[PDB]
């Protein structure tokens, strides 16, 4: 019996028999299909992390526009509670050469994410960093287990699959940067085939932003990802070992940050600019 | 990297995010994807055989209607000329419990239509004695000679479509034909995934033309136009025979009922009301 390879989250792919060019995927993000998703919980129920939408959008660029390109204005404002099976439909409609409107939805129909896919931006990779120089400039350690314990006090539960942040390094609240040691947990390394970035790794990077002292001081309570202004992968992210983040804005309502995922040599493998963290609507999880 | 099994012709399958329940497949019936389709030609152009639409419809029943079912009123529209890549979209929309409207289109031109039914508790027809069928149809018609005849009117069956070894008939007064027909060996490794391999089913359709009454009318080019009722009862991997019954044969066309049999004479697939005629070979 023949078979077709599929992205682990997007699932089965068709192009619709119409104009303009439009793509449709049907996937399953349930915990039976992806047991590691049981390890991202809000108020003790499994909820799809925002990092998963980021991966979906990233994975859609090549099939739709023919290049890995980048993703603009990704938003995900309606938390998805997971079941053993949780079907998702992903859509991409080409509006002009190099640009497509992207959507994710679940069955009553509920929108889960929107973005624009871009194939025409020839942005170049940011320059590499000296990991030693980054660490020297951020002398104060924040323990990953303690950071996750803090998350737990406000109802966000990261199990083993989402515990990839080992430690973060900061200076003071006046220096806007954080350097974190982060890696995909060992047991997930076999299954990261097919991902542009494994959502459990990307989420651990998002977590590291909260270690920043300015964020700790001012952005009080549940901070969850709500969107990302720009995402671009520059190569495989299999080897990510650090995340360098910059706090762009932080107030009582949330945080805006720019992130670079780095290999252990300091090479930039993925950029996420304008990550938004905020309270969101966790009312359904309650 | 994960993968998903797909039907060899229907291809990738999704359910649309809407009500009522509707399925969409996107496949490719081009000769690069399926080199064996190069071996069904009309005036030396590769053309999708009607038998392929029959398989698409049969294959769609279970995913849509959850279980065993059958196909009603399958009709083939403008004949589909094949290229290296020929995308096809198959649709099935549930209109009531146990019933769905079925369509095949290229892009837009409708290629086939049918109704899928899941709520028909049909009984499997009784098995036949192959030996008794053969004893009653003593007159052999050689498959190569039959295919040479088809050639004279522009229908070209290459190796993949040469599965009819011989047909056996009595006289024009007996409405039946018993054919020895098997999927050619090279295709038997791909047979996995098909309810019925279209190259096998087409060879069964060909056997109808061996009937003396059909021969007597001398219609010329006879191509499949539709099938009133298709039902599979088990795997067709071991089909070796086809018993056909001429229902009507005149200047307009031919209607026949077919049963695909294994060597034990067990009925594995029924195709009732096969319609053969002229169409639009232009």
Curated annotation (Swiss-Prot), chain A:
Region annotation (N-terminal hotdog fold) ranges: 7-128
- Which stretches make up the PKS/mFAS DH domain? 7-286
Instruction: Note down the stretches annotated as region Dehydratase (DH).
Output: 2-279
> In the UniProt entry, which residues are flagged as the active site?
40, 203
List localization entries. Answer: Cell membrane
Annotated region C-terminal hotdog fold: the residues are 139-286
Q: What happens when the gene is disrupted?
A: Disruption of this gene abolishes the production of both 2,4-dimethyl-2-eicosenoic acid, a polymethyl-branched fatty acid (PMB-FA), and lipooligosaccharides (LOS). Complementation of the mutant with the wild-type gene fully restores the phenotype.
Q: Which domain of life is it from?
A: Bacteria
How would you summarize the oligomeric state and partners of this protein?
A: Homodimer.
**Protein role:** Polyketide synthase involved in the biosynthesis of 2,4-dimethyl-2-eicosenoic acid, a lipid component of the lipooligosaccharides (LOS) which are not located at the bacterial surface but rather in deeper compartments of the cell envelope of M.smegmatis.
Record text about domains: Is organized in a condensing KS-AT and a modifying DH-PsiKR-ER-KR region, followed by a flexibly tethered ACP domain.
Put simply, this protein is called: Mycocerosic acid synthase-like polyketide synthase
Its taxonomic path starts at:
Bacteria, Bacillati, Actinomycetota, Actinomycetes, Mycobacteriales
What is the primary gene name for this protein? Answer: pks5
Whole-protein residues included? 895 to 1183 of 2111
UniProtKB/Swiss-Prot annotation, chain B:
Q: Where is this region: C-terminal hotdog fold?
A: 138-282
Q: Which residues form the active site?
A: 40, 202
Please list where the region (Dehydratase (DH)) is annotated.
2-278
Q: Which domain of life is it from?
A: Bacteria
In what residue span(s) does the PKS/mFAS DH domain sit?
A: 7-282
The written remark on domains in the entry is: Is organized in a condensing KS-AT and a modifying DH-PsiKR-ER-KR region, followed by a flexibly tethered ACP domain.
Annotated localization: Cell membrane
What's the protein name? Mycocerosic acid synthase-like polyketide synthase
Start and end residues of each stretch annotated as N-terminal hotdog fold: 7-127
Task of the protein? Polyketide synthase involved in the biosynthesis of 2,4-dimethyl-2-eicosenoic acid, a lipid component of the lipooligosaccharides (LOS) which are not located at the bacterial surface but rather in deeper compartments of the cell envelope of M.smegmatis.
Quaternary structure and interacting proteins, as annotated: Homodimer.
Q: Where are the transmembrane segments?
A: none
Phenotypic consequence of gene deletion:
Disruption of this gene abolishes the production of both 2,4-dimethyl-2-eicosenoic acid, a polymethyl-branched fatty acid (PMB-FA), and lipooligosaccharides (LOS). Complementation of the mutant with the wild-type gene fully restores the phenotype.
């Amino acid at each position: 019996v023949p078979s077709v390879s599929v992205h682990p989250l997007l699932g089965s792919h068709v192009v619709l028999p119409q104009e303009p060019e439009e793509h449709l995927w049907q996937g399953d993000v349930g915990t039976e299909a992806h047991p590691w998703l049981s390890d991202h919980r809000v108020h003790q129920v499994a909820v799809l992390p925002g990092a998963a939408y980021c991966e979906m959008a990233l994975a859609a660029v090549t099939p739709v526009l023919g290049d890995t390109g980048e993703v603009h204005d990704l938003k995900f404002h309606d938390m998805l509670l997971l079941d053993d099976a949780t079907p998702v439909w992903v859509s991409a409609a080409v509006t002009a050469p190099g640009t497509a409107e992207f959507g994710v939805e679940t069955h009553d129909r509920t929108q889960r994410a929107t973005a624009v896919l871009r194939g025409d931006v020839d942005a170049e990779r940011p320059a590499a960093h000296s990991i030693d120089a980054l660490l020297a400039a951020h002398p104060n350690r924040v323990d990953g287990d303690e950071l996750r314990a803090g998350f737990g006090t406000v109802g966000i539960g990261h199990g083993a699959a989402f515990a990839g942040l080992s430690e973060a390094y900061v200076a003071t609240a006046a220096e806007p940067t954080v350097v974190a040691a982060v890696a995909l947990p060992g047991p997930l390394r076999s299954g990261q085939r097919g991902y542009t970035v494994h959502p459990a790794l990307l989420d651990a990077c998002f977590q590291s932003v909260i270690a920043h002292p300015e964020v700790q001081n001012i952005a009080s309570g549940m901070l969850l990802p709500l969107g990302v202004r720009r995402l671009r992968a520059y190569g495989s992210t299999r080897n990510v070992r650090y995340c360098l983040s910059r706090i762009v804005k932080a107030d009582s309502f949330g945080v805006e940050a720019d992130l670079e995922l780095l290999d252990a040599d300091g090479t930039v493998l993925l950029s996420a600019m304008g990550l938004q963290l905020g309270t969101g609507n966790s009312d359904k999880a309650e």
